[PDB]
């Protein structure tokens, strides 16, 4: 985030904030949750993101022939 701000926890609330702004892939979301901020490894981060997305069940939107998740429209 600006000036090195960025999420320090990987949560449903944080994912919801991003997916309500624009559709995003899993790769796109992972970029928002950086080890330098959270202290979680890439494996730990992808695993809890998977849990969050399974629960949230956001709408799938196909963009560039790739599934994106969206909480907008
Ligand atoms: Zn995309």
Swiss-Prot record:
Induction and repression of expression: Up-regulated in response to enterovirus 71 (EV71) infection.
Lineage: superkingdom: Eukaryota
Binding, Zn(2+): 59, 68, 73
Posttranslational modification: Phosphorylated on Ser and other residues by TAF1 and casein kinase II-like kinases.
Positions where Phosphoserine occurs in the chain: 5
Location within or outside the cell: Nucleus
General function of this protein: TFIIF is a general transcription initiation factor that binds to RNA polymerase II and helps to recruit it to the initiation complex in collaboration with TFIIB. It promotes transcription elongation.
Subunit field text: Heterodimer of an alpha and a beta subunit. Interacts with GTF2F2, CTDP1, TAF6/TAFII80 and URI1. Interacts with GTF2B (via C-terminus and preferentially via acetylated form); this interaction prevents binding of GTF2B to GTF2F2.
Protein family: Belongs to the TFIIF alpha subunit family.
Protein name (database record): General transcription factor IIF subunit 1
Source organism per UniProt: Homo sapiens (Human)
